[model samples]
Target: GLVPRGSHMYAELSPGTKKVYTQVRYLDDYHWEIEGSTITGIHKKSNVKVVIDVAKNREEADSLAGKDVNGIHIVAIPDNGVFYIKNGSFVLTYRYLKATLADINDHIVWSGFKVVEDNGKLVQEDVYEYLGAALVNHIKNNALAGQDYIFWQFYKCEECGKYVDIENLEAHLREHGIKLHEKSEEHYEVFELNFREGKVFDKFGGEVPMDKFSSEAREFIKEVLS
Candidate 1:
């Protein structure tokens, strides 16, 4: 059987912070327990209550037993990090290291998923393997350039026209009163060159308002035509 003792209190105060004392008890050679004390009248002091308990077996202490207990326990201090637990499996999460700007840039490049490109400029095998290796190296060493070039060259949706600058495309979408489903955040639908549905206009040259296309779509046609 497990037994519960009277609760202990803890307070952590920053420098020059006021702590109001209610009662204090010396617990062991290395530790002292405080009770009923509150941080009164200061923003810098945090007041906390802690519970002390005694358990007869490992099951009594484990969370699966469905018993409520309270106290701060320093769990494992891994070579990478440390964690604190309190009050019957309550845990606080924190990280110890901050990534540098270079690390962040590297992460941004790593976020891009690879895609295949085919325009008959090279044999299929050479196109696939060469593009794959080149893209990997480009992203690893030149994150900003990789991001800019990849996004500029290809539109994720086949129907949406590619643009050298994404901001301009966004502005065009805004100018047109066209609304899409909110869930289709990154998906876009635009007109095809042959006036057929679901086809992309030529990337090298094209024409617009030759039909019912939006001004943005027309500009995309001009880009193709050029």
Candidate 2:
């Protein structure tokens, strides 16, 4: 969606450069031939074509222009700031807003799922609670709150003061040599998850690789990513 093919197109000189060449004759997704230039090259998918004005193909730079501004002379505005081009070389200066481009440094972004540390291992009650709370708080109050997330409450071994997965509660208690009797100190530990930014976060706000999660969480996260 970022790179446009065919003649008169513009593409980034290199990935992430933010500077694009004008009047490019596209050869393919990666390959291209520049007009008025001798360089023959391939444009990596990592880079993108620059769009001057938002409009449908075949529309003039200025839709209101009664006369079409045909393939006129071209010049690229070599700046990171937003700048729109009219009829090729002509620069139109106006205050406007466009989609905010997200920088990778500002957000947690990854290609695929990963496993958190000790996916099924036990943790101290305090540590477990803190992890779950931080995760839930980020989901509830952060801008990434709306993304899909999976949360499974945790079970704690009262005697050992350790927390285990909800599904593993009974087994964990059994391992700890405990059973439900007159008084049961064992209780549920509220836990939550976040799919903030399409990356899975655990109760501790640590990333849980897709395959690292239990089947249920894995399936749900998979669907969302797909």
Candidate 3:
């Protein structure tokens, strides 16, 4: 397949930087859901878990703009735009690129606008057929294309732009933090965590030695697995 299976299908692309804002998953080709984010301790704001999610509709996104639902906050609206947390703020809406936005809006309006605008005189059959075509294509070309992958559950690092196996993402994120914070490799611990299977491994892809885990890390793992 051109795109690796399990790739997040829809991603909100920043208009200027072209960065991936909110990535969305297409579940069995049936429905869409936002890929939840894991904010590591490196984040300046709060070290605790903060999950960024997507809303089902624009109204929901607006309603939950600055509201926190549990620890999750809605951050993107489909066919609309993305919301990001400012340095000392909660949320702010960011628009898509003008040209891309225009193209999508035109596709949506032109498909069915005649019935409402011209009083149904032209007689068109396919109404709202191309409703989300342009937007999906824009998402594909910008976010999904040129992605690196070698395994089924590979995820792209937004910071480094490299694909890593699912079990490695947590470790990879920790490595970035270590580099940024000027911490020694020996000072920081890497957990080869596989939440799906509740298993842990070492860098050699085998069972890790029991002595390597700190008591706090062991407690955390126990809590999660239990």
Candidate 4:
């Protein structure tokens, strides 16, 4: 089922960066939520707000903006229903991508094994295996796209040996004996990864073993499977 508008869509995109945030909303198992924003700069003792719009080109964005669309963007669809752009870009973080992957996988898996014993001549395990490979590839592409959004907000905690954001890291440090004193600088390390590598690691461990597939192919397969 498509996610109802205004429901939490577990995907986020930072305005200036390629980071994405994803989370499962407690209220609905089928609903995921994402919140992405770019800190253009710090606001001093005041509330901060900004406006944005989404469109295929600047002309459309401008047109929508002029129409009092406020900080939202209008995304055109093939048949109907134009999507309003939120604070950040997260077009693929909805159920559409998940549904597509599920459908493709189901199609390949079912078609390959649908034949009965009476149709022995039509047995094609190898064919289904090949199709499975293709389905895996499709899943990899979609999952990576989703993962790209997620990795943007992920920060590794060197001291805690876990992944956390700046806020959570501060809280975690406080639990220990560490404090962010005014005069003292709290150093936090940031590890950088590209979209492909980040998505790969998110799906598969840094080290994955494969006896049959080549190193590159194995990594790719593992990520997609993940």
Candidate 5:
């Protein structure tokens, strides 16, 4: 097919400087994107798509945003480059973007307003949904999109945005310490991670050689794989 008549994607546009957001409504049609983002669109279907919105013509994005899913899949966040989208999707295969906030308030709040938790973990659909969406996109967009072995694991750190693997995240909290000093944003975004079935290859589609993995990562991989 010659792409689609109803769906207009900026094959010519480049991802811009500011942070962008996008989500789609269609599962197999009326949606368009570049490179590996298509796999991501196919995965989440509706609730997430912002990861693809690097930049676009003013009219193109606004028109795409004219949807019933409540808003655009693309957002030109011309404010602080740091942003945490609620319920959208992202893949580590793409340079890990701003830490996504697992805000429970976006969902139905049975109580007054403070986001609550279930069994100590921040309970919300976005936590699982976004985490799954990110991992699915990772496989599709990365060299390891499809494989028999991949872990559903990750860690998040943020000044602007940061991510760590299973081994490192714990080492930090144990060997070091964290304080709930002054934080940014409307409320603390309890990062909901590890719903992933893992991400591979950095934005450039590269993965650390098994031999090159840190002594810790290599041992972890060996023990798990063996």
Candidate 6:
């Protein structure tokens, strides 16, 4: 449901911020006359509406960050150094958490999917795995995880490793412009996917490790995408 068009709505982040909690009257999957939205115009209080790729939206746009629409503000207490943010309403909260490579790879192998890598930068590889872990962990934990994201909003370049939205994805898609790759192996991973799926199962149908995967395993790894 929409934010009941013209409702007295306002927001701010968790751990709070100097940024004003602009009052928003309405919101949907699409942007509006809000100064910071897709359309961009009216909306004095909402000159800056925060959404995904948003500080915490990098996690779930706004659920775990803790929210309270009718109240003065949201309540998002961090856990083990994790940061949570409250964007707008309708389950508006985003959280940021880190997953280790060991846990990530373990989860990958444990789940039975396989992923090789694309010929790209390694940070993009790590970024993709982080996102992969992000997805799997959420599913392995919560159900609302599916609705927290702004569908198709985040993507990297097929020819390069540009993992930014708002300013670049569409531009590159339309060939209007593109950000060239400036790979940093220090920060990026080894340009590998390594997600869930596989062809090797034990005698009891249990999944096996990549080392024991079938000959055609690599083909299934990069077949589709996240």
Best candidate according to lDDT: 2
Off by over 4 Å in 5: 1-46, 49-147, 151-164, 179-200, 209-214
* Model 2 TM-score (2 dp): 0.24
Candidate 2 local lDDT, 73-185, one digit each (tens): 22233333433434332222211111111111112211122223366863322211223235324434543323444445544456654545555555555665766432323
Candidate lDDT (C-alpha), each:
0.28, 0.36, 0.35, 0.31, 0.33, 0.29
Candidate 2 lDDT: 0.36
> Which of the numbered candidates is closest to the native, going by highest TM-score?
5
Candidate 1 local Cα displacement, residue 22, angstroms: 47
Q: After superposition on all CA atoms, what RMSD does each candidate show versus the true structure?
A: 21.6, 17.8, 23.5, 21.9, 15.4, 17.4
Write the residue-wise lDDT of candidate 4 on 117-181 in tens digits.
44446432212211333334435555433343222122344454555444454555566566634
- Writing each residue's lDDT as its tens digit, candidate 5 over 7-82 gives 3444432344312223222323224344422212322332433324442443444443443332223333333332
lDDT tens readout by residue for model 1, 1-226: 1222332112243211111122112111113333232111110111112232222223333432343433222111112332223343312111211111112122222112223345844222211011222323333544232222221222232234433223344455444454332212242222223322223332222322333344554466556534
Name the lDDT value of residue 49 in candidate 1. 25
Question: What value does the lDDT take at residue 47 in candidate 5?
Answer: 41
- Looking at model 3, residue 41 earns an lDDT score of 13
Q: Count the backbone clashes (under 3 Å) in each candidate.
A: 5, 4, 0, 8, 12, 8
Candidate 1: global Cα-lDDT?
0.28
The ten-residue window of minimal lDDT in model 5 covers 103-112
The sequence of per-residue lDDT tens digits that candidate 3 reaches over residues 105-223 is 23232111121225755442322222233334334534221121000223345566544443455676687673422322111122334444465543223555434444434555556
What TM-score, over all chains together, does every model reach?
Answer: 0.20, 0.24, 0.20, 0.21, 0.26, 0.18
Q: After superposition, how far is residue 193 of candidate 2 from its true place, in Å?
A: 3.0
Pairs with backbone N, CA or C atoms under 3 Å apart (clashes), candidate 2:
30-43, 114-209, 115-209, 131-203
Off by over 4 Å in 4: 1-65, 75-145, 152-195, 198-226
